[PDB]
């Protein structure tokens, strides 16, 4: 389930589909909020893929299957210089027998950085955590405490009155 290639959608289909996935998760109040101001088939495929499971799709899964046309046109463009330079690099660079010494590899681990050879998934995200509800922002705007009396008045200080003679 790793080798599967993304399908090359057209751009405005890709961005429109991408924009929908973000809005359904990080800006859930956007569609309703559009109405107060005034007053394609791809996204249908994504919903129908897992109609049984109500879990909305994520940004990663959308881009793990759907990719734009330029992001897929650029890949073939860059695959040519890699495959073209392969031939360029390979041309630029009784009885008894003779000595044999080691094995030769064009890329060393001493002069060039080597390759890689070593359940791995985590970091769930709360979408509601990314914004502040209007109800909460109302609460943290209301002054409220026990007012402490000033030490002195017009003439008691610390409560005990200033004594006259009379």
């Amino acid at each position: 389930q790793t080798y599967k290639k993304p399908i090359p959608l057209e751009e405005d289909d890709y961005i429109e589909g991408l924009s929908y996935i973000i809005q359904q998760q990080y800006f859930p109040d956007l569609p309703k909020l559009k109405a107060e101001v005034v007053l394609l088939a791809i996204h249908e495929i994504t919903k129908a893929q897992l109609d049984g499971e109500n879990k909305p799709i994520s940004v990663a899964s959308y881009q793990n299957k759907f990719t734009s046309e330029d992001n897929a046109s650029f890949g073939e463009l860059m695959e040519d210089e890699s495959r073209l330079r392969a031939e360029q690099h390979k041309r630029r660079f009784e009885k008894d027998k003779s000595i044999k010494t080691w094995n030769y590899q064009p890329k060393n681990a001493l002069m060039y950085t080597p390759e890689t050879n070593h359940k791995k998934q985590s970091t769930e995200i709360q979408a509601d955590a990314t914004g502040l509800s209007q109800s909460f922002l109302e609460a943290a705007n209301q002054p409220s405490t026990d007012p402490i009396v000033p030490p002195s008045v017009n003439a008691s200080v610390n409560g005990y009155p200033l004594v006259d003679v009379n």
């Binding site: 502040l132 909460f136 922002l137 943290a140 705007n141 002054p143 409220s144 405490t145």
Partner: peptide, 20 residues
């Protein structure tokens, strides 16, 4: 938001608006 206080009336360094 609780720690920093309101934008117009920011809290002190290590003080809150109220004990609540």
């Amino acid at each position: 938001t609780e720690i920093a206080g309101p934008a117009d009336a920011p809290n002190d360094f290590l003080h809150f608006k109220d004990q609540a």
